[PDB]
Every structure is written in C-alpha cells, then in structure tokens.
Amino acid sequence: KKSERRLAFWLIAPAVLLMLAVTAYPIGYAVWLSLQRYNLAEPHDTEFIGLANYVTVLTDGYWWTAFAVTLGITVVSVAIEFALGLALALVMHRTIFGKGAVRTAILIPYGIVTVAASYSWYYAWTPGTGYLANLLPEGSAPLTDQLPSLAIVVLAEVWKTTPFMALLLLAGLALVPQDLLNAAQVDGAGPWKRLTKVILPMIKPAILVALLFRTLDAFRIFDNIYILTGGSNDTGSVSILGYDNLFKAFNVGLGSAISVLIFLSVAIIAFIYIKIFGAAAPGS
C-alpha cells in the first residue's frame, strides 16, 4: 500500500528528525572541532591543523592507561554481572516464598542514584569510619592503592547495575515453558546439565542484548570513579580523561578528539557484538 506507508513516514519523521538532529550534529561538530587548534581561553586564533590532534591523543601515555583501565573494568564487571545476574534471575523466577519482596529488594538498587551508592561505597571502605575496611588488617586503607581502588569500583558497579541485567535476563527466561524443563528432566539431564543444553541456548538473544547493554553502559562510567577515586593513582577512566582535558586545560580540540575516539571505541564494540555473535534487536 501507499496510504499507510506514507502515514508511517509522517508518524516516524518527528522522532527520527529529532534523534539524528541532536545526536548526529553533535558528532559532526566534534569532528570539525577536533580538526582545529581551538583553545577556550583565547578563541580568536583557531587555525586548522589536519590531524595533529589525534596523533597527540593516540601517542600519549595518559590515553592508553585510561583505555586499559576502562577495558579492565568493563570485562570484569560485565562477567561478574552476567554470572550474578543469571543467579538473581533464576532466584526471582523459581522461588517458593514471596517473590514480591524479592522483586522489591532488587528494584531498590535499580532506582537509587549512582552518586548515593558511590558515597555509600566510599564511606564503607574508609578505615575507622567504614565497616568493610575495619575488618581488614591494621593499617591497610584499600582506597589509596590502584588495583584495590579498581576492585572497589568494580564492586560498586556490579552492585548498582546487576538488577537491570537480572531483569533483562528474566525477560528472556520467563519465555521458557515449564514443559521443556520437565522433558529435559525425564531425559536424565539433571539440574546443571539442562541449564547448559536447554535453557541457555534458548535465551541467546536476551543474553546478547544484556551483554551489549552492560558492555556499553560500563564503557561509559564516570561517577563511580569521580566521587570514589577521583582519577588519582592513574585510575580515572576515559570519560574522566575527557572531562579533565576539556575543563581543566580548556583545549577543546583535544577534548573533542577524545570524544570522537570514545565514540569510535563504542562503535567498534557494538559492531563486533552485532555483525559477529548475532545479537539482533529485541523487536525482531
């Protein structure tokens, strides 16, 4: 037909125009801006340097340390989140007592603000004040070290952001008819042999969408490191590096170059997860 299709275009034009006029124009601007020597203190002289604002970022120490830190946090946090969220989903889906209290307890760390969660984890791991650092040996302070500080950031991120992954995995899992498990149980599989040959290959799209969401949302963390470590000890992730280089040095050429490079990193991740491993849309 043509009437209904023209009406579809008329109904879709608002959202599409809005989204790619306030998501693609910022990136076109950031590119045109990274091609320049644009300091925010003296903006009267911004000459055009071809690509010496990407070389300066890609051949500098502070860029690769931040990239390594954010990749480490991403992979470790996403793995622990997947495991623990599969556990939470199987508990919220197959429990005999009140499964309303459990959904409530799981929605509490989903609606809370990341800033308050990070303050809780910051005061918990401070010696003297915190109960979680008052049980370590004497004179430890596991928040002024690099690797322990990173472990604590991973723990904060896992706690805060596992319930959303759990709910997505449950959205996938509640589409497993009980009959299938009853048949696998008659077949002689057992509790673990079926979790790997009946229920896991069934929720492949839910697992893949949850992994994509988690990987990107962990690649774009700013506050669990802002108000918990601050970026000291060479801990700050790539978002904190962009924030620092834009607002503490005023160089917006380098700030927008870092913006473009982060966008390309996220694009490569979300292209791997899509062209490889499948992971189509949930509305497919």
């Binding site: 008819p177 009959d179 299938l180 009853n182 048949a183 149980q185 008659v186 077949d187 002689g188 599989a189 057992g190 042999k193 040959k197 009946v198 290959p201 069934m202 492949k204």
Partner: protein, 384 residues
Amino acid sequence: AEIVLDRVTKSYPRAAVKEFSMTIADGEFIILVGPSGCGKSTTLNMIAGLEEITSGELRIGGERVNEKAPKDRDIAMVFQSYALYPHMTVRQNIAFPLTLAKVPKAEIAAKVEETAKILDLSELLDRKPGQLSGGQRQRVAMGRAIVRSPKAFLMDQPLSNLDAKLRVQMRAEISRLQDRLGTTTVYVTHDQTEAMTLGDRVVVMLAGEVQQIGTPDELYSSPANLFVAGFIGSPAMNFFPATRTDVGVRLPFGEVTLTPHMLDLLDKQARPENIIVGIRPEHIEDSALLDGYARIRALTFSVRADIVESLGADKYVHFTTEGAGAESAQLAELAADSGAGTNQFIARVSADSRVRTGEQIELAIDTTKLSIFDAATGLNLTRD
C-alpha cells in the same frame, strides 16, 4: 516392563489420588480416564517421579522406586503441549535422550534413522520445530519418546492440541505403533472416544477415587456405578427416577414388568427405597418401525420432538419430560459438564424415521437392559 502399584495416595496442603491399586502387565494399555479435576494427570506425574508419592509403593518391575529421580526409571513421557526444543533440529531433538544416554554416535545415527523411518517424518531430520505442522510436531514428540525402548512408555493426552479431524488418524497411528513396539503404556485422556478406542483396560476416576477397572466392553455393558454409566456417554445416559412396582418398575411415563431374575437379584439383596433407572439412548426406538417389543412387551409413550438431527445413519431425537431427576450421589458432578438442564433426554432412532422438529412421536424402549440404580449409595444394581 510390567508396572505395578498399590495403596498409593497423594496429599496436597488433601486426598488427590488416594487409594489407587493395579498391576499393569507387560503390554497392557491402561487408560487413566476422568473429568478435568480428577487425579489422572497427577497420578501420571507421580508415576513419572515429578512428585514423590505420599504413601504406598511404586513398583516398576517389583521393587520400590518412589525415591529415584525421574532420570533413572526410563519412562519416556510424551507431553500434551509437545515439549520439544525450538533451538534444536528434529534429529537433535530425537537424539537428545540418546546422546545423554552415552550411545555410540554411529549407532546414534542408525537408531534415529530407524525411528524416523518407523514414523513418516524421515526427511524432516534437518528442519527446526518452528516450520512443522501439528501432525509431524506431535510425531517428532512420539519419536523422541520411542528411541529409548523405555520400560513404562507413558503418554499424557498427546492428541489434545490437534484439530478435531486428524485425531482419528492419530488414534489409529498410536494403536498401530503400540501394537508394533509392544511396551507397557499408560495414557491419560480427557474423553470417552479415545478411552474406548485404544485400550486394554480403563480406570474411570472421580476426584481421586477409582470407580471401575475394566475392559471397555465390560465398562460399557456392565457399569459398577452411576459415574461409570453416565461418563461413557456418546448420547449420555438418560436418568429417569421410578418406583418399585414389586412386579416390575413404573417409569414416569410407563410401567414395566421386568423379569423374575433381576427381581430376585434386587429383592434378595434388599436396599433403601430409591431407584434411579437408566436407559441408554441406543435402546429407544420409534414404535412405527418394529413390532416385536414395542407392543405390550415394552413401554411406549409420546412426546413432542423438541429437536431432531438426521446426521446420517442415525436420527437423534431430543425430548423434555417434566418431573425431576436430580438428588443423587454424584449426578450433580456428572451433569456439571454434560447433560445440562434437569430434563434433556436423547433417543437414537434408526435412519428411516418419519419425524421433523415440532411434531409428536411414539417412542418405545426395549425393556431388556434398563440399568436400575440407587440414590443413598449410587452403586449400580445390574452388575458390578
């Protein structure tokens, strides 16, 4: 092999399958039949170890098995919703139990091929269970069950999700298969057509208490209860109350002089004074086509045919006589599903009657096998 059980029960936090006992022989085809709500699906599950039996024995072979998980007994249940994995291929479905049972993969291929050759899905061993029709879907289910050569092959109303036409062919196919393989089988069902078509015995349950074990012929032509006389219905039985003439029985629209034999079987075993007579729809005919019985040696009457259906070699003639037929042991639950309305009677006349919807009729009843009953106990009085 040969599955035995006795004294078995269940308890939900209630007597669900209380007081159950039988010895299903090697090849004997038990049909656990009953109305939705009776303990058929749950006694099946119990046999399949999905719920540990509360009290009693569970002897596949001759030994206690009510402790071993379903992974051990080698039962190979089929399900009503065709539980078959979509993420697999038909051959991988069929070979799932066998690949879990540690079979050599060459023998895997050979045996799955023989199983798919027995059935008629032979070429479908590469598609997925999302591009299949109901017949071959349920056939894939049965094929997955066949392969193990199980010990008590037990089904769970597999033909419930199909249409109302392919079920005939599927009944024939299950019968032919079962007769070829030769394995013990128990078959939860929902109607009487299957329970009378495919079966060596029948177990008519009401809410948990078995009412009769017996071959379909003996379950039909000699019921042991009201429920097992009205549940094997076709045109369900017609439950007229009546009186004790002390020479015969006086119907609401007639009076019989039954016989001396049934008379002494009724009198020598005295009972309270309430007798609900039953006359199956086959025996009722139009007096205009017969002379032997319909005369003085029968009970004729007249009624306006509220509706007549000439649906082939048999004209069903309904009629509604006034009075009462309620107030019995279990006819309340019997009529909860069928025979709605306190008075709605059927008569099966031959395919050459002269009637239409809205004129009188002269119906007679062959007073030879009218099945009297009781009310204070419900038990039949013709035979056990």
